[PDB]
RNA sequence: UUGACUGGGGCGGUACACCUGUCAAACGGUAACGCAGGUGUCCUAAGGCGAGCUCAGGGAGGACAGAAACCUCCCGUGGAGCAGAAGGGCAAAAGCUCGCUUGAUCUUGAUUUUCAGUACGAAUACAGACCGUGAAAGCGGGGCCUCACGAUCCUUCUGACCUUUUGGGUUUUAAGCAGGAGGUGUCAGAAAAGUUACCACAGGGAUAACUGGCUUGUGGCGGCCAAGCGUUCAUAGCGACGUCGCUUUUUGAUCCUUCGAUGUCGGCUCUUCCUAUCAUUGUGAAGCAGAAUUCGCCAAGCGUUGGAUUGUUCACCCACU
RNA sequence: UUUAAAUGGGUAAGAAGCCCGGCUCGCUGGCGUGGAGCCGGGGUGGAAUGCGAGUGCCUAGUGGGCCACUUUUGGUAAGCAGAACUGGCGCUGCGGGAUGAACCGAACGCCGGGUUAAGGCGCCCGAUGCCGACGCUCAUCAGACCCCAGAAAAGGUGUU
RNA sequence: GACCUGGGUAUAGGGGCGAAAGACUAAUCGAACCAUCUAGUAGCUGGUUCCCUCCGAAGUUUCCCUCAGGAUAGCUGGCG
RNA sequence: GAGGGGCACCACCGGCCCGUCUCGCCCGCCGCGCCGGGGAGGUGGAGCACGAGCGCACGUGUUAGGACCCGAAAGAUGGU
RNA sequence: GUCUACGGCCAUACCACCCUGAACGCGCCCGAUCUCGUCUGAUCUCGGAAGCUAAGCAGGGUCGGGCCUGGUUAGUACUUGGAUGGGAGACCGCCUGGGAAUACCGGGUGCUGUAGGCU
């Protein structure tokens, strides 16, 4: 019916984007992945060996195995009525470091150095974040001039 | 015709087994019958030991 | 109308035993009085185990009880089990521990008493320790049943270890295809 | 599909690469007195007719051709089976091809 | 015994196992006898590794030599090639040429794909061997990736100085264990020709042939525009190229109702209804002299026959009006 | 197809974390290198909202569906054929749409008082029996309330 | 007249007899009638008997000579 | 506040037994061998890791039996 | 102020053309006896140091072409959610939120690591 073949709906996503073809740059290979690193999957098109599947392109998993040319990644995959932790072996060119935790690893750094910064000074800094509050009762100035009158323009073709 | 996890069974009832059924309703009445056949024999060989 | 629930909302525990044993009903009337009146959680755990099934109240061998009471600190407390105490043949000597159970077996209660021990019921447990103070309550291995090793994923599933229902263990009984790499596949 | 006459491959007897004499595998004289031939003879015999299925709905046109590698170094004589993906025409020792050819059809 | 799917069935086709682009609605998934095609192979190199090289095309020159022969220089981001269908990918290259080779070998698990998260097939990351190639880093366990294939039972061959051959030995044989092959294309795999109007049963309105219903392509009947025709003169009468509608008296299309039955053509007999008016009443317009016609309007009151051929509906002819 | 939304998909928002010192290794190797594991130690307030959760066994019925917005394929079209998302009908009464499977409101234990939703208030028929406001419209075929149950191009010195 | 007819007699069920219609064989004939195997089989139609309380579906996945049927996952309830 | 011992169960690491595979050396003698036993790593098993079964009763589910009830067109045996 | 060897990001780095280039270097350059490779010491390999900034190479220039970035296009086009909104329809407006792209115009045109040398 609808051709259950690997690399099927990937006319555009296993394609190098535009005017970035050629042999791949070398800092991609000089990336260091350890166990528990949070990596995100993006299959390229130049390297043919370790592309995961189109099910995982765009998703983000965790490293449990490090090999000579690849990395074992456990990702969550949505099958019909449940998710499953699938462990997929992906070569090193199709992954990169996900920055998705690195705004949390900055504010565990600047939180604990600021926690003891008030412990030595005796204050109540309240380092837990709040979402965007309603605006402060401010006081606008209209110094000298007048608010400009605008009116809806007529219709023309 | 089967279902979830169970035994895979071969019941030997594919034959006319209801004409060959044996009901042990006489098995009390055959135990007191073969007791009496031991007693009426034990006094027939009266001095000789029973069970021969 | 109010919400869109699936109506769980009927808790499916036990509020009384299905057993009609009148001695066991007197223990419940002893301990559901204690559970609502003594502010101890010992008498809530003992009371909910008197409700439990014969399956959920497994037996406890006499060698686990002396293995789980030779721990540091347990030397002069009481062994409590809502369930039976069978003995181990495997054990050689028995200490002088103090126990408490529904129904210790005949050989096990001969061996505790020779060694200087003391069997209690839940009646004279309640008069000694009403709060449950100075007790080590134990349980038998409730997944020790043979029933639980047929439970799992499915025998044909890969990495299953699930013991199929065969009418006779042996050669020619569920060993050919789906069990070895030659005859078809191995699961 | 053309394979060469000899081939330097692994032999399981000594655990080395050492050359082999590769020929073609033929099926063989179907022996009497095998267990399923003994069974088919005491089943077919009598009244009842043909007693087992005879396959007639044939579809494939080729076969998986298999080679037999024969370890050439003496007092080893280790034989084994090696398969190839299926082919219609199978040469076995002839005509290595060269690309400087006037080939004209 | 006489396959299945099927806008009823048959014939046709294969949507029956599979791959590419689209449908598909920017993760993935997604149907139709949807669209555009493809597969049951080919390859000892078109596998492997290293080296050197650059392609299609164009410009400008060179004896014959011209659109196309070979030679040279310049430009040349892939417009070439990569066995074949497409899509993706690729330039000191995955393409061309050359030198070596056989990793297209041995072995155990795990993971991915379809998926029930079973199998096959295909694949990925390893590991332990033995090897190839390269100065080396390395790369390599088939083809640049996405397809190219196949259970149980049976058979055959190979493997160990193996296991069993029933009281104990020896030998042949047979059975085993391990993995290759000989197939199931209806491709998770039966062993298979019709005919029935002499026919039978269980059903099915899940499903045709009749009406009715939705639809109006088609058939019909109408308008709007106006290049023209009408001696002249668009519109008395017509009217191309268009374009908007109505009707359910055509035929389809669909499959809603009916398969424990709605009696299926035509004619005869008989009543009513409609108007999109052939005639009769009252009228307006002509390219209306009169006569006769023609085109509109109110209008269904009242009429609309006798026959030959044909089962005819329909047709066609004679005659009356 | 260079560019490229909205909607959408994954992940992270802590003690299973952060840090320090030490020991193991047959892996790695200029290196007391690298990385894994292991032991001991140090300090918990780490988005908003809501909610009690976890897990096992046994298991019936079902495997003809249909509909409506929105997005779509085949088709001239269909109360047609086929998909996507959500709701509903089937399984479901009630108020309204006169009528009704699916529209609109709202879901239902048995009753009294109150108030509304959608819809309405000449009379059938509860409620405008308001001294309701401003205009538009004359039909010899008037118009009259989602789905929805009848119309188009074109035209009018008819009136605004 | 290859005529009509009585009684006697012969042929019997995959058999009989047929100037042939698959006609006729005891109102039964493209295979009689009686009894038994037999309560044969049916994925197909029909029916399936008291009350109240609580929870409450699915018409989709994958495989099948599969398409009016099953098996399997989902959905449910019951027990904990 | 904190600390301690931690049931059952869950997850993980380690070990053990049987089959196979690679790698290796040592040990024993009812008799010195085409003998016996051991090791270290990886794997296959419905295993061990201080036992939970048995018998009896009931309820539910499925299966074989006429199998919830009724229903064919048939096939066969022996007769009239 | 720049370079050489090796690099990272891979056009703000490329492309066409025109100027300038001290000192080190890079290079053109001069030779085949060896090493090696050619139809051809042209390339490739090997011996150098007689000349040269002509080229490459490096700076700078062009109302340059691209490339990068920004306005404008534009709250436009689309779109979430909503209505017993309009319309015979096709389609449309509003509500509640999100929000592009080209022409046209403006500004930039390599940044850096390791190691060594010149000034
Ligand atoms: Mg609504
Ligand atoms: Mg020379
Ligand atoms: Mg030479
Ligand atoms: Mg030279
Ligand atoms: Mg220069
Ligand atoms: Mg110059
Ligand atoms: Mg310049
Ligand atoms: Mg410029
Ligand atoms: Mg919207
Ligand atoms: Zn050999």
Curated annotation (Swiss-Prot), chain A:
It is found in: Cytoplasm, Cytosol; Cytoplasm; Endoplasmic reticulum. The keyword Ribosomal protein applies. It comes from the Eukaryota. One of its GO terms (molecular function) is structural constituent of ribosome. Pfam families: Ribosomal_L21e. Keywords: Cytoplasm, Disease variant, Endoplasmic reticulum, Hypotrichosis, Ribonucleoprotein, Ribosomal protein. Its main location: cytoplasm. PANTHER family: 60S RIBOSOMAL PROTEIN L21 (PTHR20981). This is Large ribosomal subunit protein eL21.
Swiss-Prot record, chain B:
It is found in: Cytoplasm. The modification N6-acetyllysine is found at residue 15. GO terms for biological process: blastocyst development; bone development; cytoplasmic translation; translation. Higher levels of expression in benign breast lesions than in carcinomas. One of its GO terms (cellular component) is cytosol. The keyword NADP does not apply. The keyword Acetylation applies. One of its GO terms (molecular function) is RNA binding. Its main location: cytoplasm. The modification Phosphoserine is found at residue 51. Component of the ribosome, a large ribonucleoprotein complex responsible for the synthesis of proteins in the cell. The small ribosomal subunit (SSU) binds messenger RNAs (mRNAs) and translates the encoded message by selecting cognate aminoacyl-transfer RNA (tRNA) molecules. The large subunit (LSU) contains the ribosomal catalytic site termed the peptidyl transferase center (PTC), which catalyzes the formation of peptide bonds, thereby polymerizing the amino acids delivered by tRNAs into a polypeptide chain. Belongs to the eukaryotic ribosomal protein eL13 family. It is linked to Spondyloepimetaphyseal dysplasia, Isidor-Toutain type: An autosomal dominant bone disease characterized by early postnatal growth deficiency, severe short stature, genu varum, platyspondyly and severe epiphyseal and metaphyseal changes in the lower limbs. This is Large ribosomal subunit protein eL13. It comes from Homo sapiens. The gene is RPL13.
Curated annotation (Swiss-Prot), chain C:
It is found in: Cytoplasm, Cytosol; Cytoplasm; Rough endoplasmic reticulum. SUPFAM superfamilies: Ribosomal proteins L15p and L18e. The modification Phosphothreonine is found at residue 157. GO terms for biological process: cytoplasmic translation; translation. There is a cross-link at residues 118, 163 (Glycyl lysine isopeptide (Lys-Gly) (interchain with G-Cter in SUMO2)). One of its GO terms (cellular component) is cytosolic large ribosomal subunit. Residues 150-187 are annotated as: Disordered. PROSITE patterns: RIBOSOMAL_L18E (PS01106). Its main location: cytoplasm. The modification Phosphoserine is found at residue 129. InterPro entries: Ribosomal_eL18, Ribosomal_eL18/eL18-A/B/_CS, Ribosomal_uL15/eL18, Ribosomal_uL15/eL18_sf. Residues 160-170, 177-187 have a biased composition (Basic residues). It holds the Pfam family Ribosomal_L18. Keywords: Cytoplasm, Diamond-Blackfan anemia, Disease variant, Endoplasmic reticulum, Isopeptide bond, Phosphoprotein, Ribonucleoprotein, Ribosomal protein, Ubl conjugation. GO terms for molecular function: RNA binding; structural constituent of ribosome. Component of the large ribosomal subunit. PANTHER family: 60S RIBOSOMAL PROTEIN L18, LARGE RIBOSOMAL SUBUNIT PROTEIN EL18. Component of the large ribosomal subunit. The ribosome is a large ribonucleoprotein complex responsible for the synthesis of proteins in the cell. Belongs to the eukaryotic ribosomal protein eL18 family. This is Large ribosomal subunit protein eL18. The lineage of its organism: Eukaryota, Metazoa, Chordata, Craniata, Vertebrata.
From Swiss-Prot, chain D:
GO terms for cellular component: cytosol; cytosolic large ribosomal subunit; cytosolic ribosome; endoplasmic reticulum; plasma membrane; ribosome. GO terms for biological process: cytoplasmic translation; translation. GO terms for molecular function: RNA binding; structural constituent of ribosome. It is found in: Cytoplasm. Residues 33-52 are annotated as: Disordered. It comes from the Eukaryota. SUPFAM superfamilies: Zn-binding ribosomal proteins. Keywords: Cytoplasm, Ribonucleoprotein, Ribosomal protein. InterPro entries: Ribosomal_eL44, Ribosomal_LSU_eL42, Ribosomal_zn-bd. It holds the Pfam family Ribosomal_L44. Component of the large ribosomal subunit. The ribosome is a large ribonucleoprotein complex responsible for the synthesis of proteins in the cell. Component of the large ribosomal subunit. Belongs to the eukaryotic ribosomal protein eL42 family. This is Large ribosomal subunit protein eL42. It comes from Homo sapiens.
């Amino acid at each position: 019916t609808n051709t259950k073949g690997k690399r099927r709906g990937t006319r555009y996503m296993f394609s190098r984007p535009f005017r970035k073809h050629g042999v791949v740059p070398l800092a991609t290979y000089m990336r260091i992945y350890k166990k528990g690193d949070i990596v995100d999957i993006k299959g390229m098109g130049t390297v043919q060996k370790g592309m995961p599947h189109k099910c995982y392109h765009g998703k983000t998993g965790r490293v449990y195995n490090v090999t000579q040319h690849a990395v074992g990644i456990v990702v969550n995959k949505q099958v019909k009525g449940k998710i499953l932790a699938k462990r997929i072996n992906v070569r090193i060119e199709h992954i990169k470091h996900s920055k998705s935790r690195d705004s949390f690893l900055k504010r565990v750094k600047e939180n604990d150095q600021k926690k003891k910064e008030a412990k030595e000074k005796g204050t109540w800094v309240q380092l837990k974040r709040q979402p965007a509050p309603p605006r402060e009762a401010h006081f606008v100035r209209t110094n000298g001039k007048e608010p400009e009158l605008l009116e809806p323009i007529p219709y023309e073709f | 015709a089967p279902s979830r996890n169970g035994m895979v069974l071969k019941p030997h009832f594919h034959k006319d087994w209801q004409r060959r059924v044996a009901t042990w309703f006489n098995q009390p009445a055959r135990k007191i019958r073969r007791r009496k056949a031991r007693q009426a024999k034990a006094r027939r060989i009266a001095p000789r030991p029973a069970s021969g | 109308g109010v919400d869109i629930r699936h109506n769980k909302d009927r808790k499916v525990r036990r509020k009384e035993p299905k057993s009609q044993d009148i001695y066991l009903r007197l223990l419940v009337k002893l301990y559901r009085f204690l559970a609502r009146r003594t502010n101890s959680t010992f008498n809530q755990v003992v009371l909910k185990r008197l409700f439990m099934s014969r399956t959920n109240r497994p037996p406890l061998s006499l060698s686990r009880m002396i293995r789980k009471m030779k721990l540091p600190g347990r030397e002069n407390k009481t062994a409590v089990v809502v369930g039976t105490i069978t003995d181990d043949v495997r054990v050689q000597e028995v200490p002088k521990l103090k126990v408490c159970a529904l129904r210790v077996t005949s050989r096990a209660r001969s061996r505790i008493l020779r060694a200087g021990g003391k069997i209690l019921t839940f009646d004279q447990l309640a008069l000694d320790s009403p709060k449950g103070c100075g007790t080590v309550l134990l349980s038998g291995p409730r997944k020790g049943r043979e029933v639980y090793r047929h439970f799992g994923k499915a025998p044909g599933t890969p990495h299953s270890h699930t013991k199929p229902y065969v009418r006779s263990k042996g050669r020619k009984f569920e060993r050919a295809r789906g069990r070895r790499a030659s005859r078809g596949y191995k699961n | 599909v053309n394979v060469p006459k000899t081939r330097r491959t692994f032999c399981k007897k000594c655990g080395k690469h050492q050359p082999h004499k590769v020929t073609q595998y033929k099926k063989g004289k179907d022996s009497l007195y095998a267990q399923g031939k003994r069974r088919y003879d005491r089943k077919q015999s009598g009244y009842g007719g043909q007693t087992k299925p005879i396959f007639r709905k044939k579809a494939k046109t080729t076969k998986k051709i298999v080679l037999r590698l024969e370890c050439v170094e003496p007092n080893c004589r280790s034989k084994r089976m090696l398969a190839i993906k299926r082919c219609k025409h199978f040469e076995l020792g002839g005509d290595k091809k060269r690309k400087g050819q006037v080939i004209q059809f």
